[PDB]
Amino acid sequence: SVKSEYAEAAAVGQEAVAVFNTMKAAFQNGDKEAVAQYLARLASLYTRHEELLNRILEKARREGNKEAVTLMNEFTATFQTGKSIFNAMVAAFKNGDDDSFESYLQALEKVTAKGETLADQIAKAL
Numbered sequence: 853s854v855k856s857e858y859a860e861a862a863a864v865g866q867e868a869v870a871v872f873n874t875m876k877a878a879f880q881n882g883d884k885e886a887v888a889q890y891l892a893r894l895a896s897l898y899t900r901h902e903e904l905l906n907r908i909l910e911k912a913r914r915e916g917n918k919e920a921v922t923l924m925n926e927f928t929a930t931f932q933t934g935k936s937i938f939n940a941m942v943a944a945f946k947n948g949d950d951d952s953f954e955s956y957l958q959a960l961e962k963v964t965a966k967g968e969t970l971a972d973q974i975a976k977a978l
């Protein structure tokens with residue numbers, strides 16, 4: 853069902869949460885080799901989350917579930933903000949700009965915390 857597909861997508865998103873926090877610790881510790889690997893792992897997780905979210909949105913549309921479509925459109929827009937911040941963080945790491953990396957890291961944490969009440973709303977709506 854689309855609901856169980858959303859629970860699967862929620863789990864992939866929580867995997868990114870866990871990997872992100874491990875990455876933040878490694879950054880603070882200066883373990884750049886670890887950070888590089890965690891950033892690659894996070895890119896794969898976000899690409900997978902984004903794809904599962906698009907399939908869920910498309911399915912809600914085909915089902916005529918107007919409220920779920922509305923919430924998923926709002927949620928998928930915010931996801932793209934996070935993706936942009938994340939990609940900027942990756943570039944800051946490539947460039948050796950720890951000041952920009954720190955900034956984007958906190959921004960991605962706040963963008964993610966803000967989008968959580970809506971994430972829970974979609975679970976109820978599908």
Ligand SMILES: O=C(O)c1cc2sccc2s1
Nearest residue numbers: 865868872898901960964
């Ligand atoms: O795909 C997701 O839901 C997330 C990726 C990341 S990276 C930091 C917080 C999050 S939440």
